[PDB]
């Protein structure tokens, strides 16, 4: 009956966290981050075992069924604790360049490790889009989602990132739009499938830049020189026609939206 522990900065984008304890490798959770476009060193997910136990091994399934955008940390460690303050490392991992999808992390401890907490902890900046499927111990319907957002001051910068739950063989234009409170949703930027064509709304051109990385399968919106009238919820969207990707009616998929607030 362990329970889940994880970084408080994360938000659930799909699934529910009971799926990480149900004994099923094919159910999981996709996390995002409304405060930052990267998952940074120190973020973690794992188990509070509820008491001390002599651990003989672990089986943690990271990633989750299918393809899609980058979904796993590149460098991270397995570490454990008795008091939830002092951690000891068991193993470090470098999975840089791994394709999307499940990775079953199965470890056996020749001599038992006494712990009440055990977790995977990020070592290096990675996209803030992470999926996990299962956390266990041993003891004797494409969806787009945006990360990044929050409060920044005028003259400051913020970057947004959008990931997808599946990969397509087709070429999709991607676009950002935004809606300020009780104003019509408005086009912000679009980019063609191969990245070579971009266009911007009049009021952001020369301050915002759209770009994409088709290997990570991410689309970005770099927002520089921020102004109070950039305050809005920002949505990423996908359209199989670059011409209509700037129209409200064009896109076939829309993200969940992320609040951006620019104060004076
Ligand atoms: C819009 N798109 C998401 C998508 C596409 N290009 C991207 N490109 C970048 N750089 N970043 C993204 N977030 C991104 N997202 C889609 C659209 C359709 C299907 C989809 O229908 N996939 C089928 C296969 C059919 C197909 O290949 O279209 C499946 O079973 O996964 C997947 C992703
Ligand atoms: Mg599961
Ligand atoms: Mg279409």
Residue numbers in the entry: 1 to 140, 175 to 298
Direct quotes from the study:
Using several starting points, we evolved CID systems controlled by a therapeutic drug methotrexate. Biophysical and structural analysis of methotrexate-controlled CID system reveals the critical role played by drug-induced conformational change in ligand-controlled protein complex assembly. While comparisons based on limited number of repeats must be treated with caution, the structural and biophysical analysis of the selected binders suggests that they exploit ligand-induced conformational changes in the anchor domain and do not form direct interactions with MTX.
The well-defined density for MTX molecule is located in the cavity formed by CDRs 1, 3, and 4 of VHH domain. In the complex, the nanoCLAMP has a 700 Å2 interface with the VHH:MTX complex that forms two interaction clusters. Cluster 1 involves interaction of invariable loop 64–71 with CDR1 and CDR4 regions of VHH. Binding of the nanoCLAMP introduced surprisingly little change in the structure of the VHH:MTX complex. Binding of MTX to VHH leads to restructuring of CDR1, pushing it out and rigidifying thereby providing an anchoring site for the invariable loop Lys64-Asp71.
